[PDB]
Design a protein around this ligand. Sequence first.
Ligand code: Q2F
Length: 126
Amino acid sequence: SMNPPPPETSNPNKPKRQTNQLYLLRVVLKTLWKHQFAWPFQQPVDAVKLNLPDYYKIIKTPMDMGTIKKRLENNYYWNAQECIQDFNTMFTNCYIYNKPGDDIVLMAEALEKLFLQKINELPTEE
Ligand SMILES: CCn1cnc2c1c(=O)[nH]c(=O)n2CC1CCC(CNS(=O)(=O)c2ccc(OC3CCOCC3)c(F)c2)CC1
């Protein structure tokens, strides 16, 4: 099958801004990205190349760390809640598509545990 176009990372009609919490790029994203389990989550799923049939019939809100990184770099998010939701969509997609206890699920759970540790230390708005 064909892959869908990836999620937008910038939009000329959506207001842009930078906040000190959007920490999410320099601390949270970077800490997850360097983890040895991060690589399957760093780019959109290519369903044919990864042999994942049926993926985009099941997952209609795909999300990956590469998209989140680029959204942050482009000032796409207005607030931390929008960015956190994308991380959580990424984890949830993995838990929905794959079977419980699969290696990829255990990898996502380890990244999610680390994510929550970093979110716990999200700074107050300046
Ligand atoms: C997220 C989108 N996405 C991308 N690829 C996807 C998916 C998707 O949604 N489902 C998919 O199936 N795939 C294909 C996969 C399936 C599996 C996979 C792991 N291979 S691995 O990095 O060599 C590896 C690592 C850790 C291991 O064990 C530890 C032991 C302690 O707990 C944690 C697990 C281990 F045994 C093997 C890599 C791609």
